[PDB]
Ligand binder design. Structure first.
Ligand SMILES: [Mg+2]
Ligand SMILES: [Zn+2]
Length: 325
């Protein structure tokens, strides 16, 4: 049921060389992979090698894994291959800036989790799947798509010559799969609200302890949210263009809801585009800003993400005031 890359595909990736100019740029939080589509797979290989080492994974297996992962992302407007690499790059930037706070197992697990976090997304939300009793909602009662994304990740690792984690001891193997499962499930925004509230209290009260596994899991969860939403931390033109894709996907879902006799939320109604600016403002104030604010308190080096988010919030406010260019 899983798609598999071709020999030419992974062999081409193995021989790929990243332009010297980008080496400096890829380290920055605001880096936009947009202009370099043919290089996305190679960019991921580069990040894995710089963060985990060139010997962390068998090159041949890593290349097969990456190209097959790409082949299992669908041609949807937003939750696609581009999104996956964008999220993985944000994680790379976070890890590079807080390197020793995480174990080697955590860094390799997290970069991989980010690349695979939206595998086989069909362009429909958990709300849709549960509202219309999709088979997936029956199998996964909560965090529906996220549980599916993890299942898809394991399915790729089970493909011949694709298990990049097989060389880990049985103990570390089980541990990394758990790191990945928890990280992917954490991308369910429904869980973000409680997680951020919990982390904020632990931070303010001074009880946050990174040698406490449950605390580490929560911090990693917030990192996943921060990476998943990073489009709001790019330069305004990039953030605005990405919003177009996000809504294109939303509107298609809303169209299906109307066909089922249900009026969609305004956000998914293509006949209510005038409400988008205020909708974005609401998302930034209720989700984005608090996320990066707490992330910055726990991991000071991530401050650039918060600054960029604040700048884009100001841009949406300008749109609401009718000052758009
Ligand atoms: Mg997702
Ligand atoms: Zn995502």
């Amino acid at each position: 049921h899983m798609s598999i890359c071709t020999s030419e595909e992974w062999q081409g990736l193995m021989q790929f060389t990243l332009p010297v100019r980008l080496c400096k740029e890829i380290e920055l939080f605001h880096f936009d992979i947009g202009p370099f589509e043919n290089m996305w797979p190679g960019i991921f290989v580069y990040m894995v090698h710089r963060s985990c080492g060139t010997s962390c994974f068998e090159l041949e297996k890593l290349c097969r894994f990456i190209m097959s992962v790409k082949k299992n992302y669908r041609r949807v407007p937003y939750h696609n291959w581009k999104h996956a690499v964008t999220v993985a790059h944000c994680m790379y930037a976070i890890l590079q800036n807080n390197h020793t706070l995480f174990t080697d197992l955590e860094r390799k697990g997290l970069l991989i989790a980010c690349l695979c976090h939206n595998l086989d997304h069909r362009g429909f939300s958990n709300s849709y799947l549960q509202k219309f009793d999709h088979p997936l909602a029956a199998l996964y009662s909560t965090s529906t798509m996220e549980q599916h994304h993890f299942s898809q990740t394991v399915s790729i690792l089970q493909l011949e010559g694709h298990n990049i984690f097989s060389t880990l001891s049985s103990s570390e193997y089980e541990q990394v799969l758990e790191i990945i499962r928890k990280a992917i499930i954490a991308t369910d925004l429904a869980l973000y609200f409680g997680n951020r509230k919990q982390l904020e209290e632990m931070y303010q009260t001074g009880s946050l302890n990174l040698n406490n596994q449950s605390h580490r899991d929560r911090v990693i969860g917030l990192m996943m949210t921060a990476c998943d939403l990073c489009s709001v931390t790019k330069l305004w033109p990039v953030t605005k263009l990405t919003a177009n894709d996000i809504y294109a996907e939303f509107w298609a879902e809303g169209d299906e809801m109307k066909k089922l006799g249900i009026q969609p939320i305004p956000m998914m109604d293509r006949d209510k585009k005038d409400e988008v600016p205020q909708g974005q403002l609401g998302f930034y104030n209720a989700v984005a800003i608090p996320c990066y604010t707490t992330l910055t308190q726990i991991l000071p080096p991530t401050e650039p993400l918060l600054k960029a988010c604040r700048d884009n919030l100001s841009q949406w406010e300008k749109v609401i005031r009718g000052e758009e260019t």
